[PDB]
Amino acid sequence: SHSVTFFIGLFTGCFVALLAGYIIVAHLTGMYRQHSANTFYMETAYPVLSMFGLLFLHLFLYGCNIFMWRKARINYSFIFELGSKNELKYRDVFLICTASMSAIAGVMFVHLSLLEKGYSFRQVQVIPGLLLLGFLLILICPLNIFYKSSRYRLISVIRNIVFSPLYKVVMLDFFMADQLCSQVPMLRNLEYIACYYITGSYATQDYEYCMRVKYYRDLAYAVSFLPYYWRAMQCARRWFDEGETSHLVNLGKYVSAMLAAGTKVAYEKERSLGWLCLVVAMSSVATIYQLYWDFVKDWGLLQHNSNNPWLRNQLMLRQKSIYYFSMVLNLVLRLAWLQTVLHSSFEHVDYRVTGLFLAALEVIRRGQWNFYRLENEHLNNAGKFRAVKTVPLPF
Numbered sequence: 001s002h003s004v005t006f007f008i009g010l011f012t013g014c015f016v017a018l019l020a021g022y023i024i025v026a027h028l029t030g031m032y033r034q035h036s037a038n039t040f041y042m043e044t045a046y047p048v049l050s051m052f053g054l055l056f057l058h059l060f061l062y063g064c065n066i067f068m069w070r071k072a073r074i075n076y077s078f079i080f081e082l083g084s085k086n087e088l089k090y091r092d093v094f095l096i097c098t099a100s101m102s103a104i105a106g107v108m109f110v111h112l113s114l115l116e117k118g119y120s121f122r123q124v125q126v127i128p129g130l131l132l133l134g135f136l137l138i139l140i141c142p143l144n145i146f147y148k149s150s151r152y153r154l155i156s157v158i159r160n161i162v163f164s165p166l167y168k169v170v171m172l173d174f175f176m177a178d179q180l181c182s183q184v185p186m187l188r189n190l191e192y193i194a195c196y197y198i199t200g201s202y203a204t205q206d207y208e209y210c211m212r213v214k215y216y217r218d219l220a221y222a223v224s225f226l227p228y229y230w231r232a233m234q235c236a237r238r239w240f241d242e243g244e245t246s247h248l249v250n251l252g253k254y255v256s257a258m259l260a261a262g263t264k265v266a267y268e269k270e271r272s273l274g275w276l277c278l279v280v281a282m283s284s285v286a287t288i289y290q291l292y293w294d295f296v297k298d299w300g301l302l303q304h305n306s307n308n309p310w311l312r313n314q315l316m317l318r319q320k321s322i323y324y325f326s327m328v329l330n331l332v333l334r335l336a337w338l339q340t341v342l343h344s345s346f347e348h349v350d351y352r353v354t355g356l357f358l359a360a361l362e363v364i365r366r367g368q369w370n371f372y373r374l375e376n377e378h379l380n381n382a383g384k385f386r387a388v389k390t391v392p393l394p395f
Contacts (some may be wrong), residue, residue, distance in 0.1 A: 073394060074378050
């Protein structure tokens with residue numbers, strides 16, 4: 001109502017002022033760009049702010065999509081089979097992303113402040129891991145507190161995602177399985193906060209315990225490409241349930257961007273020109289094989305014989321130049337995707353503040369992908385996830 005607009009802007013300005021306070025106190029206290037002797041800043045506290053700054057950028061873009069789907073008269077509640085009974089509105093989503101990230105920036109500004117003065121060096125290196133465990137417990141908080149039946153709708157989907165070929169596929173565990181494919185640099189910022197606090201690297205402050213042995217270096221990379229494995233096994237399930245041959249062509253899309261990741265690991269052990277050809281060809285095969293599926297099969301555009309040139313026959317936006325801007329913005333932004341599915345940020349140094357800017361551009365590319373995907377479920381039925389083409393009017 002009238003008070004929700006206040007608290008959205010209250011936690012927005014609290015988030016921004018806490019970051020400008022955090023950046024300035026980082027700029028002048030040695031820990032700006034690894035100037036100080038305490039080198040643990042850009043490896044033990046920076047993955048905690050990189051994992052939460054990409055998880056609440058994706059949740060913010062889902063709140064922007066609800067605003068877009070309701071103005072363009074997309075019946076996204078009927079398409080997602082959400083129905084009724086306290087719909088998550090876009091003002092409710094913006095309230096989550098700003099109140100949570102102000103709490104993360106509050107504790108992370110405490111942590112950057114409360115170590116120069118001293119204060120229990122063995123115990124203060126638990127407050128980054130305490131912030132992640134606090135939000136892990138909030139997501140499984142069962143009472144009635146933080147949007148019950150919307151947090152347990154989420155874990156009911158991720159249960160169907162991780163156990164991928166065991167469960168049937170609908171358009172909610174297909175939709176959320178593609179949101180995980182843009183969070184591949186985020187899941188590498190979670191296999192270090194599951195190795196610094198479970199293997200005793202925070203007791204004597206052992207710094208490079210995980211990256212020193214290379215049995216946790218390719219295993220931090222082969223387990224990084226799990227969302228491309230979970231989504232490829234879902235296409236292997238719709239080919240079992242249904243009998244369309246397009247699911248096998250869809251299956252090859254996610255395996256093509258696993259072979260491109262696989263050739264580079266073979267290139268990093270036999271560095272020469274012979275593996276340099278296969279790392280620029282398989283990474284260019286996989287790029288054109290996902291740009292083909294985004295424009296033709298997902299968005300439903302590039303129809304050869306149509307009234308609108310290079311688009312489909314029936315359009316939903318009246319300004320028909322937004323489609324041409326989105327077909328070029330998605331083409332450019334599938335190049336920051338090839339620098340997250342190939343090279344991580346923990347293997348080479350000094351490309352860490354630009355390795356998060358390329359990681360935050362694949363989250364925005366899944367922001368404009370959600371709008372034209374459901375638009376191709378209303379003016380078409382592309383996924384045949386529901387069999388009647390007629391969609392009723394939204395409430």
